[PDB]
């Protein structure tokens with residue numbers, strides 16, 4: 001499963017000491033994604049100011065804002081010659097602007113140096129603050145993603161810093177700004193199949209274009225227990241359900257990480273968007 005483009009990329013990463021989520025989180029898709037020249041980057045440090053029971057990011061006091069991070073990310077993207085880059089980060093309630101500047105500047109830096117690279121920006125909610133969100137939207141990523149992750153009943157318990165309505169509102173906000181929007185559902189957290197169906201419906205109504213539906217992998221014993229393993233035939237049904245609701249791009253199964261096939265999904269959302277308005 002090891003190809004020449006994966007090989008070139010790992011060489012470049014090693015020699016330059018570039019940090020990627022792909023290597024550092026031990027993602028099993030790396031062979032496939034790097035062959036398509038797609039990679040994922042973490043900004044804002046690895047200590048989040050919030051706590052979600054499914055999430056592998058540690059909660060802690062974040063280090064000082066590193067304003068050189070955007071340049072650093074854009075340079076890694078350039079060095080790797082990526083066709084698609086995902087930028088993700090933690091919540092930054094310690095910062096007065098929630099880290100809005102950092103997210104936007106990273107996108108702007110990437111696009112200034114990599115005009116042919118599609119950029120996907122996965123954001124926290126910024127408290128749903130219109131002016132923070134507007135700052136981020138203006139950066140103009142190819143995809144604005146904000147993952148609701150689970151259904152309302154479970155959401156209110158294991159994402160105490162968020163609300164289901166505010167998050168859906170982030171997606172609606174991004175859709176009005178003209179962005180292609182994306183969200184993720186994590187199955188195996190205790191949700192019912194019916195709750196999954198209404199959540200997909202909610203996301204579609206919120207204006208979401210791309211949805212990924214994946215299996216919960218419990219990070220450690222301190223984290224939320226796995227409530228089930230979804231069968232393949234069940235992922236297929238959910239995927240067909242989402243396609244039938246009119247999502248432009250749908251991916252379901254053991255995806256391990258939310259950025260799996262991000263480039264292909266964007267392409268489908270862009271192709272269908274062009275098709276519609278032609």
Ligand code: SF4
Pocket residue numbers: 048049050051052055056057089090091124
């Ligand atoms: S999901 Fe986001 S806000 Fe919640 S712990 Fe993980 S990084 Fe922090």
Ligand code: SF4
Pocket residue numbers: 021022027028029030031033034038039040257258259260261
């Ligand atoms: S799925 Fe995401 S984290 Fe994993 S290799 Fe692909 S781009 Fe990197």
